[PDB]
Design a protein around this ligand. Sequence first.
Ligand SMILES: [Ca+2]
Ligand SMILES: [Ca+2]
Ligand SMILES: [Ca+2]
Lengths: 503, 514, 515
Amino acid sequence: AVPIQPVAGAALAAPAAGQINQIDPWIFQNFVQCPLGEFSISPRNTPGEILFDLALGPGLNPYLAHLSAMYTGWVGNMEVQLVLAGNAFTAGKVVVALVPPYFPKGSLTTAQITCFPHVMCDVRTLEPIQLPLLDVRRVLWHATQDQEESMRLVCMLYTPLRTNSPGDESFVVSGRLLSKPAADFNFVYLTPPIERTIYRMVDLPVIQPRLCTHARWPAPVYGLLVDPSLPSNPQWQNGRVHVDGTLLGTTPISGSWVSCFAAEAAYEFQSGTGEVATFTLIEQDGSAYVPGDRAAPLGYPDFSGQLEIEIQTETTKTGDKLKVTTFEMILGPTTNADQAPYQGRVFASVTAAASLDLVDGRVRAVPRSIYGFQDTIPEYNDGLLVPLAPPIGPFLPGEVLLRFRTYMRQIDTADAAAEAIDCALPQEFVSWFASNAFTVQSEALLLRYRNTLTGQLLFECKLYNEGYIALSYSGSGPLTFPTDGIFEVVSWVPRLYQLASVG
Amino acid sequence: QDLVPAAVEQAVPIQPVAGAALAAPAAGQINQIDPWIFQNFVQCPLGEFSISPRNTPGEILFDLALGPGLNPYLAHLSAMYTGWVGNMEVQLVLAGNAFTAGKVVVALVPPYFPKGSLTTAQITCFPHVMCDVRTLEPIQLPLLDVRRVLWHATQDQEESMRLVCMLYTPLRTNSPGDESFVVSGRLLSKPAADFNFVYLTPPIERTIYRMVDLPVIQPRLCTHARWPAPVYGLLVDPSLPSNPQWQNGRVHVDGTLLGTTPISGSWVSCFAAEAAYEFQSGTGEVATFTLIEQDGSAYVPGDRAAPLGYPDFSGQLEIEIQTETTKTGDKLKVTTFEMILGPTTNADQAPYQGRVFASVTAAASLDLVDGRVRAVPRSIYGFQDTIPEYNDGLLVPLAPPIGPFLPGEVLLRFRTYMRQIDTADAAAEAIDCALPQEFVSWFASNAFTVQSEALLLRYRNTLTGQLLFECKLYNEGYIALSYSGSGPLTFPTDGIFEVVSWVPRLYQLASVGS
Amino acid sequence: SGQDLVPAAVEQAVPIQPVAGAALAAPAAGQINQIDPWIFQNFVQCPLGEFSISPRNTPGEILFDLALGPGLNPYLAHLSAMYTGWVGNMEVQLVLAGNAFTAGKVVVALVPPYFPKGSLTTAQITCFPHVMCDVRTLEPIQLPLLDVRRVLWHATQDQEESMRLVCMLYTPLRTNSPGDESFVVSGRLLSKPAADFNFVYLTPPIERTIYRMVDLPVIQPRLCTHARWPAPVYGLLVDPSLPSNPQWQNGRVHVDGTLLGTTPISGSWVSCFAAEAAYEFQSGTGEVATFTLIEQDGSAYVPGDRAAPLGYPDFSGQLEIEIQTETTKTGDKLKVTTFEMILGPTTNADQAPYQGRVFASVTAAASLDLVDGRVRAVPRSIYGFQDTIPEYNDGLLVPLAPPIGPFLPGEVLLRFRTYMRQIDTADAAAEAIDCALPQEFVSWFASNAFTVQSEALLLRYRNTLTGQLLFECKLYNEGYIALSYSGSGPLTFPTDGIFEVVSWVPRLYQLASVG
Ligand SMILES: [Ca+2]
Ligand SMILES: [Ca+2]
Ligand SMILES: [Ca+2]
């Protein structure tokens, strides 16, 4: 069919392999869906778009991906099926090409796609199109726990779709790809099964949101909502984690480090403000702090306002040795006094008429209350710029951020409403991703929120690699969801995947 | 009885190496090349080198690697294939007198031999040919594909057989007379009978083994890379500092931009910021600028020293920005501000941290509206060619100083003239750059591969085709000329640079004199 | 001769296919190469060919781990210095012929390339092609090592992924003998190449390769130089009554060549310094000299990852030093004067050698007209010597070399001892100072830069005039020597012998007691 030579599999690996291992003959009799092998074609699409691009390897089949954990290597070819869903009143064409292992990745055009060994397929095709996937390589076999260059399968839109549509829908053309191993596929060497393999699917802890911990204020999570009338691209420096396990910003690992800090204190009495203390910050585990590539030590608060803190103070006066004292610090936006957490120094003041003989030493400060709270980053430098984390985004047209909401301890005189603060992910998910260290596949994960008892689906969402969730919402007023569901992982989806609208 | 001849010819013995026979079962195709490419020796892209009496025994004269980068035909054909396999054959010619004494050795070094420092005793332990600089005829060697893989990838340069040349004995002339005599050497190659390509792909022009070229524009029709003005002069001057530390107009040959070099020539000595004004009652209007990028993005302190295109010299600068007033009768105008670049003690300038100050004297209290401004240069006062106050008084990342040069080489400078305020003298103020604009471009638009340490270029007159000088373009973006005089020497600016070949670091240029 | 034990593990089937060797690499080489046919005909001891099994080991401990390649044979390790490439299989012999009053089991497995190194628990070692062996076996057990690979040959100067041979203690070793001790098993490893082993491409013979096992200088300890005080080495001893983990800063060197702490290269830099001196006359203590320290070759000193300049003293007490001075009076130009220096913390130390700042004083009535300049100070006397690190920073922390250790239970440190010149009012006993290695060994290691293999080296100390081996010791890769001694008093040895290298050993090796 295509202009290519036959490729030898185990006949080339056998002399230098230790064993050649066989696979269940029933696996050779079933075509299974490939991951990321599906697309939709619209009348508004332009020729030259990539529909799918899949690389040869064990990860194309769930059974082979499972079996990969007890072996050292693999060899051989596969066979794939393409299924298109059109009818007799359509027009258009696609091209499927065979790209060799070491072709420089980039962007192709319709002119260049026909210079590979390819097949041209019409949209009106009834039967599935069957293709081979051959193992072109410069080695004798591949390693299971190490991904190398392989032959690829790339699909492009060649000639556009011409159709009629009704007044309510638009008639996309759907395509799916399935695959199975060929008669010349083998594994190499029996090894003890490994649990931390690279073909391991991402999962989430089975915990309800109402039992979790907020990642920006030390309080239980009280709400879960989307509100389009709020800044769509916030720049919070806490609660930022990557799916592969990389912490971002000033995010700590433990929930007891949130909005607290540790330092060394020096107290002195000024007949003006009262008693002032200059804290030289360190890490909460006792290690030293070096100003590097983040705005502050791990866990430092990332909002603006006037904060109250308690520390353990020891006075050398007679009849008294230990107590707990509450100070008052200013961390609002550009407030009049030289606050440099980035350099590692802060100032606090307390009201006093005499000198309280407080001995200096190591101090850990935790928050009490906030006055004049704003959702803006604090004054890390006097007026200078600081290394930060990029704002959350971007979102597709019509996508809104999902927020986990809790309430803080306020100080106020005129108003009596609650003080709401939101985060992107709860603190348990941060530690889950840090301790699991999965392998990222494409751009995002598809999730499902469901009720534990009745098994009822509530909405859909997308979990991006950077660690934020997006919903397809078209309203204006805030929408609130129950906090007794469970999040479940479905599959890997591309960035341009269209969610089902909620509300 | 049996006779042992005293003079035997040469010809290193080999064992045949298999090519497409080993690669056929696992490749998709085996592609044939034209049968007449096997019949001619053609100059390699790296096919020029020199030998001088200043060279010492043990120095490496050239080092070639097996592959499609040794033949222009094979390098042209590699653009539509994914792999290659097979052997080659190399030829060498030298141009000497009968007054020159000296010996060199050409050895075959296998892959995975450590790349440290060979000596004269070790070089003869490889399969080799011994040559002397008085030979009239060319000398040829084979190049076999000793490898652990089935074939090679044309786009990734792996380890293969090498061809290294070393100076075995010193170069001596009996009576010196011309002690500056240089021996020229050239290299040629062709494929051997067992060479093939692998997989037919579409032809991609932006591939490796594509030869570097330069835009066909005369230097006087170009834009200066450090001050927004046309290029007016082109010279060399040994009385100026040898290794400047300029930050603009610096780009790697492979396309990497160094320092704060921008892509467009309208970003030079300009900046974009958010402006907040105030009226300190003593001096006048004072403006605080929070710096951003000139395309509207956000500036983040990273591995640079300032936003792209920020001025990299000293003095006091006049700038113009658009201002909107809140007064009655006027809406918009252009206002001139005075700024300090050179550090003395004051103004606590920190473009690296993103905050800049400017001022303008005024008895009134003009109520300008805070907003977005773009500042462009107007005039310079007290110009000095030293990097400005980047941090307050601290150290920031910087591009390395230009260099090094071989003994006798000097830097080629493109010169333009600035607009200055000077109440004492009427002499023009000149500023130099290493590469002009449209040369910062054409790099990172084309992504070339270096294949060597330097490029040889010839400067020519558009008509009458006269050669003016020769120069070496180093991989770091500066041009060197062989000049030994004491004062400045200028050149006409209606020429065209042309690419000759890749040359090593130790290449010796023909001297330039007035 | 009594068959109270198992004669052979001669045949347990190993589930593996035959592997092709040099036949796949012949069309890819440009030469014809061959190994001497007589090398293929006898079994010789591996460079790592000795190991121990003790009744103190627990199941799951790894006894030996051998990687396939030209480092398992002395002939092949010598031959690999003049080649680029190797390929083939090998045969190994294991000797475990313990006493008939013993019991235990071990497992030897074939671990493929690319399997992660690390844990290898006792549960998963039987999931490989393996063989189970008794410690009483009379005959040597013969095992194959095959070249499972996806390339055509391997580079000799690089260490790549190949099949390994791992031996783990499966059951504890016990003796049912009617008195007073349990036996230790001494196992041996031998190797030879298989039929299709070869090399690839002839290369200039270079001595400094990754192989070439470590050597030692042929010098008697009594003819060497002490590495912590400028004096000859006088004693060689072990003493369990002294601190077991000293934190000396001088004389520390890694077997691979890296110098640790403030160890200088030359022996003339020890306990000396060089500085720029400023002189003043204080109406109290007399003449005070302030020294700003530099390097001893004239270079500049910058406080980095060391506590002091190279060769600075690393003990405490009052040190008397001699210095060269010039005066601007009449009738006297140059002389040598003695200064006193406080090295200890003493809760009052303006000195901070970590910042290049020291002071000394000399009693004087009238100000001697001494001129400033550059000076070098060398030691003369010690008073109130204490073997503790000085106050590098007046009260703060400085980077330091780690304390010497750890040791196995029953292992003590071997010390090279010299004597210092002291001032004393009522006691006339000599004052002694110890070091771990002499300066000649430091220079040897810094100049040779060997490649280490597993964890340590086995050494044997012979006698020159008799040819008698006196003891055996373990030289750890970090640069200290441990003996197995269980006495209470000190034990000294003659200082007219030569150390020699035997084999590579792990940290679990059990030494014989002395003496
Ligand atoms: Ca409120
Ligand atoms: Ca002027
Ligand atoms: Ca004493």
